[PDB]
């Protein structure tokens, strides 16, 4: 039930891997930077829709919803990108269907893009099925955050998702041949958070470069993702 709801949410908020845009894809500045910004802001509405489809999420104080969302947006944008992309081939696929190459992105994302592809690769070598990934993505947002009004409520939804993930992995001796798979899975969240600090560094860099000022929406993003 919950797992099915988590999977539908994922499916409904992701591009059909049979409806991808390769118009500007080529495995061969101010232009690539603004693009970096667009991609980020473009996924904001997509991921927000996804969050609203997480059972129990709409039952949290609206204030707690925006706090959870905003604090995890970047992590969510990167985890989703990492899961649907083809690391080996260096093909990046965004929440909107656009497909760029690891090299075309390096001009906008910076060397961070290389850190992302590496994460994408480690993530895929874990062979995470759609159900386990749908739980993990939800766990990246439904987690403890400073400033929460209903921290106990967040913790309850969190534990419900981990339990849902645990049953999926251990049902009928599903864990026998993958001992700490559940632990390795959860372990990807702190790695993801560490990974996203470089996204903040990049945004800071572009702001100090003052070659192309970040939009208020992203300037805002910088502050919401800021751990402190």
Asked if 88 is part of the footprint of a copy of itself (rule: CB under 8 A), the reply reads no
Q: Applying CB under 8 A, does 171 fall inside the site for a copy of itself? A: yes
17 binds Br ion (CB under 5 A): yes
- Residue 55 has phi, psi (to 5 degrees) of -55, 130
Rounded CA separation 176/55 (Å): 30
Strand residue runs (E) in the chain: 91-93, 99-101
Q: In the set 21, 106, 155, 181, which binds Br ion (CB under 5 A)?
A: 181
Return the residue matching tokens 């129990």: 56
* Own/partner long-range contacts of 125-133 (Cβ < 8 Å, ≥24 apart): 126/181, 126/184, 126/185, 126/188, 128/83, 128/185, 130/7, 130/10, 130/11, 131/3, 131/6, 131/7, 131/168, 132/165, 132/168, 132/169, 132/185, 133/10, 133/83
> With respect to Br ion, which residue has the nearer C-beta, 130 or 200?
130
User: Of 21-29, 115-123, 164-172, 194-202, which segment contacts K ion by CB under 5 A?
Assistant: 164-172
Q: Which does 200 bind (CB under 5 to 8 A by kind): a copy of itself, K ion, Br ion, none?
A: a copy of itself
Candidate residues 20, 186, 189, 200; the one interacting with a copy of itself per rule CB under 8 A: 200
Q: CB–CB of 84/93 below 8 Å? A: yes
Q: What is the per-residue binding string for a copy of itself in 40-69, x denoting contact by CB under 8 A?
A: ---------------x--------------
Stretch of 5-13, 52-60, 135-143, 191-199 lying at the interface with Br ion (CB under 5 A): 5-13
Residues in contact with a copy of itself by CB under 8 A are: 1, 3-5, 7-8, 11-12, 16-18, 55, 127, 129-131, 147, 149, 168, 170-180, 183, 187, 197, 200-201, 204-205, 207-210, 213, 215-217, 219-220, 223-224, 226-228
């Amino acid at each position: 039930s919950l797992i099915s709801a988590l999977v539908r949410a994922h499916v409904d908020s992701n591009p059909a891997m049979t409806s991808l845009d390769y118009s500007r894809f080529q495995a061969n500045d101010t232009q690539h930077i603004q693009q970096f910004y667009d991609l980020l802001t473009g996924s904001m509405e997509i991921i927000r829709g996804w969050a609203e489809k997480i059972p129990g999420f709409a039952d949290l104080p609206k204030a707690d919803q925006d706090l959870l969302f905003e604090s995890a947006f970047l992590e969510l944008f990167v985890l989703r990108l990492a899961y649907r992309s083809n690391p080996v081939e260096g093909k990046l696929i965004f929440c909107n269907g656009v497909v760029l190459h690891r090299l075309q992105c390096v001009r906008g994302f910076g060397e961070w893009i290389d850190s992302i592809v590496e994460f994408s690769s480690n993530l895929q070598n874990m062979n995470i099925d759609i159900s386990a990934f749908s739980c993990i993505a939800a766990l990246a947002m439904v987690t403890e955050r400073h400033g929460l009004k209903e921290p106990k409520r967040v913790e309850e939804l969190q534990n419900k998702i981990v339990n849902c993930l645990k049953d999926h992995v251990t049902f009928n001796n599903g864990g026998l041949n993958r001992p700490n798979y559940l632990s390795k899975l959860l372990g990807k969240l702190p790695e993801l958070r560490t990974l996203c600090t470089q996204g903040l560094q990049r945004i800071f860099y572009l702001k100090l470069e003052d070659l192309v000022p970040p939009p208020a929406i992203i300037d805002k993003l910088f502050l919401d993702t800021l751990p402190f």
